[PDB]
Design an enzyme around this catalytic site. Sequence first.
Site, PDB file in Angstrom:
ATOM      1  N   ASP A  57       0.857  -1.195   0.000  1.00 57.24           N
ATOM      2  CA  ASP A  57       0.000   0.000   0.000  1.00 57.24           C
ATOM      3  C   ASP A  57       0.893   1.247   0.000  1.00 57.24           C
ATOM      4  O   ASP A  57       1.908   1.262   0.684  1.00 57.24           O
ATOM      5  CB  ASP A  57      -0.804  -0.115   1.306  1.00 57.24           C
ATOM      6  CG  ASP A  57      -1.779   0.964   1.386  1.00 57.24           C
ATOM      7  OD1 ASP A  57      -2.919   0.901   0.851  1.00 57.24           O
ATOM      8  OD2 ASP A  57      -1.513   2.051   1.989  1.00 57.24           O
ATOM      9  N   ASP A  59       0.329   4.440   1.186  1.00 55.81           N
ATOM     10  CA  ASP A  59       0.382   5.451   2.255  1.00 55.81           C
ATOM     11  C   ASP A  59       0.060   5.002   3.653  1.00 55.81           C
ATOM     12  O   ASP A  59      -0.003   5.824   4.569  1.00 55.81           O
ATOM     13  CB  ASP A  59      -0.600   6.574   1.876  1.00 55.81           C
ATOM     14  CG  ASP A  59      -2.035   6.239   1.747  1.00 55.81           C
ATOM     15  OD1 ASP A  59      -2.330   5.040   2.062  1.00 55.81           O
ATOM     16  OD2 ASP A  59      -3.006   6.945   1.403  1.00 55.81           O
ATOM     17  N   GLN A  61      -2.560   3.752   4.973  1.00 55.72           N
ATOM     18  CA  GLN A  61      -3.939   3.966   5.372  1.00 55.72           C
ATOM     19  C   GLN A  61      -4.827   2.969   4.674  1.00 55.72           C
ATOM     20  O   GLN A  61      -4.678   2.872   3.442  1.00 55.72           O
ATOM     21  CB  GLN A  61      -4.388   5.400   4.977  1.00 55.72           C
ATOM     22  CG  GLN A  61      -3.537   6.399   5.754  1.00 55.72           C
ATOM     23  CD  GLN A  61      -4.265   7.732   5.864  1.00 55.72           C
ATOM     24  OE1 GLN A  61      -4.977   7.974   6.837  1.00 55.72           O
ATOM     25  NE2 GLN A  61      -4.091   8.544   4.835  1.00 55.72           N
ATOM     26  N   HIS A 142     -10.820 -20.197  14.111  1.00 51.97           N
ATOM     27  CA  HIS A 142     -11.140 -21.606  13.761  1.00 51.97           C
ATOM     28  C   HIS A 142     -10.135 -22.096  12.715  1.00 51.97           C
ATOM     29  O   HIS A 142      -9.586 -23.182  12.923  1.00 51.97           O
ATOM     30  CB  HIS A 142     -12.572 -21.571  13.165  1.00 51.97           C
ATOM     31  CG  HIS A 142     -13.004 -22.893  12.590  1.00 51.97           C
ATOM     32  ND1 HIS A 142     -14.004 -23.693  13.120  1.00 51.97           N
ATOM     33  CD2 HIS A 142     -12.569 -23.461  11.433  1.00 51.97           C
ATOM     34  CE1 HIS A 142     -14.154 -24.777  12.405  1.00 51.97           C
ATOM     35  NE2 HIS A 142     -13.327 -24.609  11.379  1.00 51.97           N
ATOM     36  N   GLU A 143      -9.853 -21.287  11.696  1.00 46.38           N
ATOM     37  CA  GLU A 143      -8.896 -21.770  10.677  1.00 46.38           C
ATOM     38  C   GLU A 143      -7.483 -21.849  11.238  1.00 46.38           C
ATOM     39  O   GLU A 143      -6.777 -22.840  10.901  1.00 46.38           O
ATOM     40  CB  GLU A 143      -8.891 -20.842   9.456  1.00 46.38           C
ATOM     41  CG  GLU A 143     -10.217 -20.799   8.701  1.00 46.38           C
ATOM     42  CD  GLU A 143     -10.776 -22.144   8.339  1.00 46.38           C
ATOM     43  OE1 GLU A 143     -10.089 -23.198   8.299  1.00 46.38           O
ATOM     44  OE2 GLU A 143     -12.010 -22.134   8.081  1.00 46.38           O
ATOM     45  N   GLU A 177     -12.773 -15.523  20.525  1.00 47.31           N
ATOM     46  CA  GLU A 177     -13.755 -14.440  20.450  1.00 47.31           C
ATOM     47  C   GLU A 177     -14.022 -13.887  21.858  1.00 47.31           C
ATOM     48  O   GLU A 177     -14.154 -12.646  21.959  1.00 47.31           O
ATOM     49  CB  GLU A 177     -15.001 -14.984  19.811  1.00 47.31           C
ATOM     50  CG  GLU A 177     -16.061 -13.871  19.643  1.00 47.31           C
ATOM     51  CD  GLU A 177     -17.154 -14.441  18.890  1.00 47.31           C
ATOM     52  OE1 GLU A 177     -17.028 -15.068  17.781  1.00 47.31           O
ATOM     53  OE2 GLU A 177     -18.366 -14.351  19.287  1.00 47.31           O
ATOM     54  N   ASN A 183     -18.065  -8.758  21.249  1.00 47.74           N
ATOM     55  CA  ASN A 183     -19.441  -9.240  21.310  1.00 47.74           C
ATOM     56  C   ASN A 183     -19.464 -10.757  21.409  1.00 47.74           C
ATOM     57  O   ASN A 183     -20.077 -11.363  20.536  1.00 47.74           O
ATOM     58  CB  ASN A 183     -20.224  -8.893  20.042  1.00 47.74           C
ATOM     59  CG  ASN A 183     -20.601  -7.427  19.929  1.00 47.74           C
ATOM     60  OD1 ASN A 183     -21.247  -6.871  20.816  1.00 47.74           O
ATOM     61  ND2 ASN A 183     -20.223  -6.793  18.823  1.00 47.74           N
ATOM     62  N   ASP A 185     -20.089 -14.872  21.915  1.00 47.37           N
ATOM     63  CA  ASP A 185     -21.214 -15.760  22.075  1.00 47.37           C
ATOM     64  C   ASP A 185     -20.758 -17.196  21.792  1.00 47.37           C
ATOM     65  O   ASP A 185     -19.558 -17.365  21.553  1.00 47.37           O
ATOM     66  CB  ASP A 185     -22.343 -15.464  21.094  1.00 47.37           C
ATOM     67  CG  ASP A 185     -21.758 -15.230  19.732  1.00 47.37           C
ATOM     68  OD1 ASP A 185     -21.081 -16.109  19.179  1.00 47.37           O
ATOM     69  OD2 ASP A 185     -21.941 -14.158  19.158  1.00 47.37           O
ATOM     70  N   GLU A 190     -21.403 -15.808  13.079  1.00 51.71           N
ATOM     71  CA  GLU A 190     -22.544 -14.882  12.994  1.00 51.71           C
ATOM     72  C   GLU A 190     -22.162 -13.518  12.446  1.00 51.71           C
ATOM     73  O   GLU A 190     -23.093 -12.871  11.889  1.00 51.71           O
ATOM     74  CB  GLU A 190     -23.159 -14.716  14.388  1.00 51.71           C
ATOM     75  CG  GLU A 190     -22.333 -13.937  15.379  1.00 51.71           C
ATOM     76  CD  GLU A 190     -21.182 -14.765  15.810  1.00 51.71           C
ATOM     77  OE1 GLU A 190     -21.145 -16.028  15.770  1.00 51.71           O
ATOM     78  OE2 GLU A 190     -20.210 -14.216  16.323  1.00 51.71           O
ATOM     79  N   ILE A 197     -29.917 -11.127   7.074  1.00 53.16           N
ATOM     80  CA  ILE A 197     -30.728 -11.801   8.087  1.00 53.16           C
ATOM     81  C   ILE A 197     -30.227 -11.601   9.477  1.00 53.16           C
ATOM     82  O   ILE A 197     -29.078 -11.927   9.784  1.00 53.16           O
ATOM     83  CB  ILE A 197     -30.823 -13.294   7.731  1.00 53.16           C
ATOM     84  CG1 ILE A 197     -31.607 -13.504   6.426  1.00 53.16           C
ATOM     85  CG2 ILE A 197     -31.516 -14.069   8.842  1.00 53.16           C
ATOM     86  CD1 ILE A 197     -31.509 -14.913   5.896  1.00 53.16           C
ATOM     87  N   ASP A 226     -19.722 -34.817   3.283  1.00 53.07           N
ATOM     88  CA  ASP A 226     -18.916 -33.975   4.196  1.00 53.07           C
ATOM     89  C   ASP A 226     -17.826 -34.767   4.886  1.00 53.07           C
ATOM     90  O   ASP A 226     -17.616 -34.681   6.109  1.00 53.07           O
ATOM     91  CB  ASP A 226     -19.845 -33.332   5.216  1.00 53.07           C
ATOM     92  CG  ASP A 226     -19.234 -32.278   6.123  1.00 53.07           C
ATOM     93  OD1 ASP A 226     -18.292 -31.577   5.746  1.00 53.07           O
ATOM     94  OD2 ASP A 226     -19.716 -32.145   7.277  1.00 53.07           O
TER      95      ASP A 226
HETATM   96 CA   LIG Z   1     -26.975 -13.204   9.434  1.00 53.27          CA
HETATM   97 CA   LIG Z   2     -19.199 -16.334  17.464  1.00 50.39          CA
HETATM   98 CA   LIG Z   3      -3.798   3.199   1.199  1.00 49.80          CA
HETATM   99 CA   LIG Z   4     -20.034 -12.719  18.348  1.00 45.93          CA
HETATM  100 ZN   LIG Z   5     -12.734 -26.269  10.030  1.00 48.78          ZN
END
Ligand SMILES: [Ca+2]
Ligand SMILES: [Ca+2]
Ligand SMILES: [Ca+2]
Ligand SMILES: [Ca+2]
Ligand SMILES: [Zn+2]
Length: 316
Positions: A57, A59, A61, A142-143, A177, A183, A185, A190, A197, A226
Amino acid sequence: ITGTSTVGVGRGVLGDQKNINTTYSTYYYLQDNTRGDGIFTYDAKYRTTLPGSLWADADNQFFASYDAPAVDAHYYAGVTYDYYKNVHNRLSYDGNNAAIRSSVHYSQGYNNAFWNGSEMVYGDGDGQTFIPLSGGIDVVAHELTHAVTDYTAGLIYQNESGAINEAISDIFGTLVEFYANKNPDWEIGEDVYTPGISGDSLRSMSDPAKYGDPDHYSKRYTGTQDNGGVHINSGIINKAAYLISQGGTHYGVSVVGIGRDKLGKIFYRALTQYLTPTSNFSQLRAAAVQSATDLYGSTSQEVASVKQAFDAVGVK
Ligand SMILES: [Ca+2]
Ligand SMILES: [Ca+2]
Ligand SMILES: [Ca+2]
Ligand SMILES: [Ca+2]
Ligand SMILES: [Zn+2]
């Protein structure tokens, strides 16, 4: 790149402003030299060749909409590195400060993210099912936890061991998290799932059956989709981990919750000392009981709660 460490500023996927560690050498690159052997974020420019180009990049920013997924992949990889170092005394995913590499803008309208055995890769989503997937701290963590699993227990990605591998990534994704206090949970993805939604998520640890995943061993999926149900049968282990932390009564079995920090200590010990590539759910129960015994004593409340939680989800 070789250059001078500095700090830039940008906006993530959800519109929030954050400071990010960068390196200056003609351009400012997304290269954080303050954590281990470094955290490096690359632009895959809508192609599938990896890793792409190290993000540069002019600058320092990063407020362009194209920049947002790179700002969050780079920042949340640093948060995840800090959780593992500060809470579990583990330096990076290999325990020896391996560089962490992520590429964003992979392919076109790609609704997933993954650890490929060498780096993390994030699609931008199609804008309806998902928005850019690095905007979710629980997705990034998770990854990166798949890299931790790969370098330790080595759980193979199919059938019960694959479902354990996926549950461990959702467990530690959620614990990061809560560590970041963003936030928090017990739901997965989410912040980046279905932008039109409100209130939903990809998976739920507190009630997996909300989205149709099993919450008891008697309801496990036994087909071949899966990879043998690795994202479906992880709900059985996710619900046991939620009960160990929070407590509750499930299918008439009552569990006294011992909290998130002991949940993280028990499962990190199980993952790093007792699980092997082909461990199944019954062996995970034995590893978690042995881990809680090591840390708290065979007659502790902690061991009792681990047993009650696996009895509640039907894992003996
Ligand atoms: Ca959603
Ligand atoms: Ca979560
Ligand atoms: Ca920039
Ligand atoms: Ca959350
Ligand atoms: Zn996974």
